[PDB]
Amino acid sequence: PQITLWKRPLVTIKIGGQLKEALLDTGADDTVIEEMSLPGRWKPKMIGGIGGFIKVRQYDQIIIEIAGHKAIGTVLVGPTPVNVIGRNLLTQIGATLNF
Amino acid sequence: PQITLWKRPLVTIKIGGQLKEALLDTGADDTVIEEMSLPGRWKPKMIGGIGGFIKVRQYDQIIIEIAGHKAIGTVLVGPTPVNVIGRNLLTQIGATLNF
Ligand SMILES: CC(C)CN(C[C@@H](O)[C@H](Cc1ccccc1)NC(=O)O[C@H]1CO[C@H]2OCC[C@H]21)S(=O)(=O)c1ccc2c(c1)OCO2
Ligand SMILES: [Cl-]
Ligand SMILES: [Cl-]
Ligand code: NA
């Protein structure tokens, strides 16, 4: 699709057997999801944005379906105010910015 | 152009006759730039990012060039860790997300 930016570019994702809404976010290096359980090992991480840093759990090799497109990569889980699909997964679905 | 996301989507902007680097950020509603001087009056705004809320100075109707495209709109000035071009100006330059 071509998504305009008049409104937030929100899509449905499937992660860990759950449906969630998330923002397609070119300014996010990493994918950050609100608190949920995921399988496998994790390690702690701090990530920073406007407002400062939050502590997250880093899970690797997680499969996510984004607007119908499957991708695998690292997912950070923690107290983000919005679920964000970052560049690590946007690349895998072939997303580009065009103007 | 068509910008892939393997690296941060950094572009050169020009504001107040000065060149700066900024991130094309589809996850930002608003454009937020580091401390600098802008003309006219400002109004208060609070914005919420991953680590919490910050106060910024809102300047309206500011002339800004983004990757060679001219925009005129609202710029927020405050302690952002990177300059971000948000949807308010991405729409003015005709940007879309495509996959
Ligand atoms: C600020 C940029 C450099 C980074 N952020 C991504 C943004 O797209 C963020 C994504 C975001 C969106 C909403 C709430 C929190 C974060 N947007 C944001 O802060 O926008 C602010 C400016 O406009 C306003 O509209 C949205 C909030 C305000 S982020 O959320 O802090 C972030 C995401 C993934 C990351 C990361 C930081 O570090 C490593 O991986
Ligand atoms: Cl990854
Ligand atoms: Cl590619
Ligand atoms: Na894993």
From Swiss-Prot, chains A, B:
<feature type="active site" description="For protease activity; shared with dimeric partner">
    <location>
        <position position="25"/>
    </location>
</feature>
<feature type="domain" description="Peptidase A2">
    <location>
        <begin position="20"/>
        <end position="89"/>
    </location>
</feature>
<feature type="region of interest" description="Dimerization of protease">
    <location>
        <begin position="49"/>
        <end position="55"/>
    </location>
</feature>
<feature type="region of interest" description="Dimerization of protease">
    <location>
        <begin position="88"/>
        <end position="99"/>
    </location>
</feature>
<comment type="subunit">
    <text>Homodimer, whose active site consists of two apposed aspartic acid residues.</text>
</comment>
<feature type="region of interest" description="Dimerization of protease">
    <location>
        <begin position="1"/>
        <end position="5"/>
    </location>
</feature>
<protein>
    <recommendedName>
        <fullName>Protease</fullName>
    </recommendedName>
</protein>
